Amino acid sequence: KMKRGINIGNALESPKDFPWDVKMSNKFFDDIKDAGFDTVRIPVRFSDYTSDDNFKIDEDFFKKIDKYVDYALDKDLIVVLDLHHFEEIMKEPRVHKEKFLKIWQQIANRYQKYDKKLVFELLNEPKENLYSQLLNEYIEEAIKIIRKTNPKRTIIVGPYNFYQIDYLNELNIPKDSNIVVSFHYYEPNDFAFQGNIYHKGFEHLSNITWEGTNEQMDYLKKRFDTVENWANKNNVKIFLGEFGVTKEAPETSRRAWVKAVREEAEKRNFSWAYWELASGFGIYNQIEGTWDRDILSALIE
Numbered sequence: 320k321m322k323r324g325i326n327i328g329n330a331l332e333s334p335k336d337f338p339w340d341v342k343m344s345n346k347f348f349d350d351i352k353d354a355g356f357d358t359v360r361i362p363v364r365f366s367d368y369t370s371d372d373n374f375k376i377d378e379d380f381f382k383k384i385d386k387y388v389d390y391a392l393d394k395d396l397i398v399v400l401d402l403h404h405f406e407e408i409m410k411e412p413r414v415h416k417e418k419f420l421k422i423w424q425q426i427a428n429r430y431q432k433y434d435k436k437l438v439f440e441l442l443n444e445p446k447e448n449l450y451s452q453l454l455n456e457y458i459e460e461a462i463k464i465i466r467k468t469n470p471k472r473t474i475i476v477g478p479y480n481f482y483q484i485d486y487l488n489e490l491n492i493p494k495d496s497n498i499v500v501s502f503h504y505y506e507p508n509d510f511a512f513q514g515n516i517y518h519k520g521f522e523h524l525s526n527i528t529w530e531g532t533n534e535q536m537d538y539l540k541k542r543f544d545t546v547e548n549w550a551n552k553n554n555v556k557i558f559l560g561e562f563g564v565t566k567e568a569p570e571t572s573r574r575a576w577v578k579a580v581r582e583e584a585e586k587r588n589f590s591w592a593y594w595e596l597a598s599g600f601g602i603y604n605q606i607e608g609t610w611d612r613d614i615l616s617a618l619i620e
């Protein structure tokens with residue numbers, strides 16, 4: 320099902336009391352669908368909308384999610400609903416385990432009848448103190464809750480340290496046929512993030528190139544070898560849930576990197592979703608509804 324996807328980023332994963340620079344809008348799903356994408360990824364920071372008791376998700380905000388998911392779903396888009404930027408659980412996972420499992424109880428109860436095309440992504444980029452042996456324990460506990468109301472819906476999990484290839488070996492594949500494994504890919508980091516203010520440590524880089532040299536192509540291929548090999552041995556399909564390049568980077572390298580990564584993904588039967596529609600990594604002007612053909616051409620011929 321999933322192949323060509325895009326993230327609506329820096330939108331609903333914004334902090335509850337500080338919105339970021341992209342305003343979610345139904346027109347987005349029209350233009351994404353018409354561009355050739357079959358899949359949209361929607362990061363949502365539900366953790367900012369809980370009664371911090373039974374951890375009841377604010378119904379107001381929750382209705383906002385009904386609006387866009389239904390609209391997206393009523394265009395035949397696959398919608399990955401993604402619990403994004405749950406920051407407190409990365410610092411003290413043991414304190415927020417229950418808050419995490421309560422959150423997925425509500426989500427699964429509420430969209431249990433929804434079309435197959437609605438997919439669940441449990442926890443974006445586990446990092447810091449939520450290390451693998453806890454992450455796996457919480458992942459198994461969340462799937463068994465979800466599986467009472469959503470027994471066949473697709474569920475996406477990912478490894479520790481920002482969904483990193485290097486931590487796939489520690490990620491446990493659950494007892495379950497309907498699970499996709501996701502990694503993120505932005506290597507090399509200094510080229511992909513250069514000049515972006517939101518990427519702490521990268522904001523003052525400048526004019527770094529990716530020309531597609533043989534060593535550069537070789538590295539990319541070996542990194543993707545590592546993931547394919549893992550996925551073969553574990554009989555799971557892989558989803559490249561985020562990849563992209565900031566706008567500040569050199570126009571021509573940006574296109575070549577994105578093409579090369581997209582191509583390598585498809586070459587190995589990976590679904591993918593480009594990091595980010597309309598923000599600092601974007602390829603789409605939210606004010607005029609126009610695309611950056613130069614980058615869009617790299618993603619979809």
Ligand SMILES: OC[C@H]1O[C@@H](O)[C@H](O)[C@@H](O)[C@@H]1O
Pocket residue numbers: 329517518599600
């Ligand atoms: O999704 C994680 C992060 O990635 C960056 O692209 C966004 O600009 C940041 O504000 C966000 O914290």
